């Protein structure tokens, strides 16, 4: 009853997970790429064969590139396509030194300056992509410096990310799998109490953050918080975990899990595997390859929303129809189609990040957050956001 598990998981509905992947494994520009959905489908009970040789030939292309570029690759982005070449059993720098170690050994160097010596100061990204970029050094078995971990471990003994903009556990289980990789190695062993502390911390953190239905903050952060769980374990966690199980079987019934990077995070831990497993993963594992679905009948319903947007002079409301099943995205674009209404994204990992509303782009430390009224924020983007008839959708300038 210590471990970890979610048995009994519906077949159908994890076969479909591994089918909404299947197809964008040929969406290969650099401008789509995304090296979760490669770990993601590795570690998984499900496989896209050739496609996946083809899909890291490009992740290498791309990365190597940007060392040619067109955008700006993050720390984190780069610790992802770390974990991606752990996920072929490939390792950098174990002869020579390597650009891309070093790449990101210098990330976290800046934001550990950004930080500050009193911690008073903010990452330039955030926490989370600070202990993904730990977590992948590691995994290729390269420290940092004692420096570097000690500004996430004070972060988590602070309770540091409550005033993030995020308030659920998704950044507390990341830190947390880069401590459990730390610990394994014992690397920065001046700093292994607070690590051991830490990594008993954040588990504790992600037991009381379920909720009734099951979920660990919200049923997105779950998957991670899955991951820590499963690390290693512990008095409670069989029952814990088979309230997620519930929750989750639930959520997939419910539409949940139709974004490739949240399908990324989900399909490890439906395999009983973390990221903690590329530390020396099995490259020949047994998956099932998968098959295209069949497209869904289109659909004539119409659903009726209202967007507002109070932070821009003169503010914003209009009731619009779209067809049901459509996206906040669709909505967006039928008031644009329908007025002065204007919006603008950039690409992510994640899908369109809305960047500007009726002219106002987010500033440094702003975003545009997406909230059902009254003040229920969204737990899906612009894409992946589906508005019920009668709801009313407000976006909101906020401060980081
Ligand atoms: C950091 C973060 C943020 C930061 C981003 C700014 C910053 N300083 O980096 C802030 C707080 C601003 C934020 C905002 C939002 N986020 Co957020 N975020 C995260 C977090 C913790 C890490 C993302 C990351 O760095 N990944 C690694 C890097 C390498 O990947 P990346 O794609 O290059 O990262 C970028 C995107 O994640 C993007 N971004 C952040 N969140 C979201 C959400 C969506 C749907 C999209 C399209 C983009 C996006 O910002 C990152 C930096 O540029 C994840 C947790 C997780 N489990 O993934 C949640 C997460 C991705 N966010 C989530 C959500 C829902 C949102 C919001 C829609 C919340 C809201 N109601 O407004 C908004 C975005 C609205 C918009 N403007 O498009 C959900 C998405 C779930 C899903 N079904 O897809 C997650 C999984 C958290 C959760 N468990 O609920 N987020
Ligand atoms: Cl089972
Ligand atoms: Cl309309
Ligand atoms: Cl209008
Ligand atoms: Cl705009
Ligand atoms: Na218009």
């Not at 479909?16 to 789509?32: F, H, I």
Request: contains cysteine; charged residues 20%; aromatic residues 8%.
């Amino acid at each position: 009853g210590e471990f970890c598990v979610i048995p009994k998981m519906d077949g159908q509905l994890v076969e479909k997970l591994g089918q909404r992947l299947l197809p964008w494994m040929d969406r290969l520009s650099s401008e789509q790429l995304n090296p979760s959905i490669y770990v993601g489908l590795r570690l998984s009970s499900m496989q896209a064969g050739t496609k996946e040789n083809l899909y890291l030939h490009n992740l290498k292309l791309h990365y190597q590139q940007c060392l040619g570029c067109q955008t700006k690759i993050s720390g984190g982005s780069l610790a992802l396509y770390l974990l991606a070449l752990r996920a072929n059993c490939e390792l950098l720098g174990s002869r020579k030194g390597d650009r891309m170690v070093s790449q990101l050994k210098w990330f976290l160097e800046d934001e550990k300056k950004a930080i500050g010596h009193h911690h008073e100061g903010h990452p330039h990204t955030s926490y989370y992509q600070y202990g993904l970029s730990i977590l992948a050094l590691c995994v290729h078995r390269k420290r940092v410096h004692d420096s570097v971990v000690g500004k996430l471990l004070y972060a988590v003994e602070h309770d540091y990310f409550t005033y993030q903009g995020h308030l659920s556990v998704d950044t507390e289980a990341m830190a947390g799998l880069a401590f459990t990789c730390l610990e394994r190695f014992n690397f920065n062993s001046d700093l292994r109490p607070r690590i051991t502390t830490a990594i008993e911390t954040v588990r504790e953190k992600i037991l009381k953050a379920q909720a009734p239905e099951g979920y660990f903050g919200n049923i997105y952060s779950t998957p991670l918080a899955l991951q820590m769980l499963m690390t290693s374990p512990g008095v409670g966690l069989g029952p814990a975990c088979l309230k997620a199980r519930k929750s989750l079987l639930l959520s997939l019934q419910d539409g949940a899990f139709q974004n490739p990077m949240m399908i990324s995070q989900l399909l490890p831990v439906l395999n009983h595997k973390t990221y903690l497993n590329l530390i020396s993963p099995d490259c020949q594992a047994p998956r099932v390859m998968l098959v295209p679905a069949t497209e869904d009948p289109v659909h004539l319903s119409e659903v009726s929303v209202t967007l507002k947007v109070s932070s821009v002079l003169p503010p914003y409301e209009r009731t619009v129809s779209v067809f049901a099943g459509a996206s906040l995205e669709d909505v967006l674009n039928r008031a644009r189609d329908l007025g002065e209404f204007t919006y603008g994204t950039q690409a992510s990992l994640s899908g369109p990040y809305l960047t500007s509303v009726l002219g106002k782009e987010a500033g440094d430390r702003e975003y545009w957050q997406l909230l059902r009224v009254p003040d229920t924020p969204l737990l899906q983007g612009i894409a992946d956001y589906k508005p019920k008839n009668g709801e009313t959708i407000e976006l909101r300038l906020v401060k980081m």
